Subunit: 114 residues, 3 copies
């Protein structure tokens, strides 16, 4: 699985352990080993949400399976809670795009997972 | 909706009210409430288009509905127009990928839109 | 076609000509003329792969057609090979997402390809 956060929160306000915290929580959330989880945080971004420049985040979660109606409602609660406590972002200023990827469309280690 | 621009144009060339303008034009183009429109501009990028490092842009628009054949042609005219007028990027050096997202695959404020 | 690579490798480790090489190799691999190939390289990123901060990359390839089972394995061998040789990234620390785009959902030069 792959999780990306783009935010206007400055770099110095991203805690040093945030990437490892995300990795561990997403491994439990998805039921996949932490070795398979990749995380990417992009601070200091020029963005607005509803026309306002208060702190906000635009995110995406890709995974081969473990994506769906009930699961995505649970992920949103987990991720909003993490962004609220660690980055101080209000949860109504968070978007997360979920992607259920086909194994043939994910490359890794010179091949694909198909 | 969510709109992202990645470009090699320098940060200093992005006009002050550019995020505000994108928000208002996208609300009028999609008919979506401006309170739910997010915009994101990433300048100073290392990019090439057709092998050339002249000004270019790679963009995306995600939306629940309001995506389709005729609508996407109209969005493309509007967005290339703004990129040409505001950032001086030639329209033939711009790609825009459009994504019709399922309401269950868009997370917001501890839930999804389904 | 559009190829994007995000990596934690420093900008000074990207060799001169890297974007030209990607443009030429992807033109040959996809069969499309190089005029229509776009490439985007984002170094110095804050990311982790498996909870480790060793060099890694998160990538995507978008194409109108030329996306499929055997084709995507061949792209993965080519692209992991380039990232290993030029950027010194191990292939088992690379993810590439593949997207088969519908022509009606790709804007260019004030309109769409369909
Ligand atoms: C007038 C009716 N009405 C009311 C509320 C309302 C609230 C939200 C939305 C909405 C949000 N996205 C969205 C955002 C980010 C993404 O990344 C994405 F894929 C989709 N698409 N639509 N639409 C509406 C809406 O049409």
């Amino acid at each position: 699985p792959m999780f990306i956060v783009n935010t206007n929160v400055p770099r110095a306000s991203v805690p040093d352990g945030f990437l490892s915290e995300l990795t561990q929580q997403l491994a439990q959330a998805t039921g996949k080993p932490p070795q398979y989880i990749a995380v990417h945080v992009v601070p200091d971004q020029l963005m607005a949400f509803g026309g306002s420049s208060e702190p906000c985040a635009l995110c995406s979660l890709h995974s081969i399976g473990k994506i769906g109606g009930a699961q995505n409602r649970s992920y949103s609660k987990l991720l909003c809670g993490l962004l609220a406590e660690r980055l101080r972002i209000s949860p109504d200023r968070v978007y997360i795009n979920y992607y259920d990827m086909n194994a043939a469309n994910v490359g890794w280690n010179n091949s694909t997972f198909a």
